[PDB]
Amino acid sequence: PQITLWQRPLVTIKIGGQLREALLDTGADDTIFEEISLPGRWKPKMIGGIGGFVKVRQYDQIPIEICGHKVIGTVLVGPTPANVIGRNLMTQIGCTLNF
Amino acid sequence: PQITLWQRPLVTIKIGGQLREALLDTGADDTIFEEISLPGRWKPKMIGGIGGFVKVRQYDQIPIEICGHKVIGTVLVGPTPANVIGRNLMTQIGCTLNF
Numbered sequence A, B: 001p002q003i004t005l006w007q008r009p010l011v012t013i014k015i016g017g018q019l020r021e022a023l024l025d026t027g028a029d030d031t032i033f034e035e036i037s038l039p040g041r042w043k044p045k046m047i048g049g050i051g052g053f054v055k056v057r058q059y060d061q062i063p064i065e066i067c068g069h070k071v072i073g074t075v076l077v078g079p080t081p082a083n084v085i086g087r088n089l090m091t092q093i094g095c096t097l098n099f
């Protein structure tokens, strides 16, 4: 679908059997969630934003259902005031900017 | 323009006679620019993201030229590891997200 930007680009997500809303963020290289339980091993990792750094957990090969689409990729779980879907997943569902 | 997301969505900008490169960021409501010089008086505003918050200067009604499109809007200037064009300016050039 086409998404205008007069409102936050929010999509409904299904991950690890858990439902949540995420922000389609083109300005984000990776995907990050604030509070969801994912199974398996994870690798410590740190990401930076406008505020500073953040210790997150990296999980790979995680099936995520984006707006009705089944995609698999690396998901970061850590302290964030907003759930974000980055370009690492947006390319799998064919997202493109247009103007 | 149709831009895919295999690369960061960067665009060239002419702002206040200065040339910059910015990221088209749908996950940002406001436009943030790291150090540039702008006219007139501002208002000490604070914004947040990953890591925390930051103190910035809020400039209203500043003309920006994105890909040859000239629009006037609010620009925040402050410490930021990357210039960001938010939704406040992206709606001006009719930029949509498609997939």
Ligand SMILES: CC(C)c1nc(CN(C)C(=O)N[C@H](C(=O)N[C@@H](Cc2ccccc2)C[C@H](O)[C@H](Cc2ccccc2)NC(=O)OCc2cncs2)C(C)C)cs1
Pocket (backbone or CB within 6 Å): A008, A025, A026, A027, A028, A029, A030, A031, A032, A047, A048, A049, A050, A076, A080, A081, A082, A084, A086, B025, B026, B027, B028, B029, B030, B031, B032, B047, B048, B049, B050, B080, B081, B082, B084, B086
């Ligand atoms: C509370 C919540 C419901 C919301 N608040 C807001 C309003 N706010 C504050 C913003 O839009 N703030 C913007 C912002 O940081 N947006 C962010 C999303 C976000 C929003 C709110 C809270 C936390 C993160 C999204 C932006 O694309 C930035 C851009 C960027 C990239 C490199 C270096 C610096 C900056 N992205 C990141 O910092 O991404 C970090 C990463 C996560 N995974 C991989 S990198 C500013 C640039 C203005 C929107 S949703």
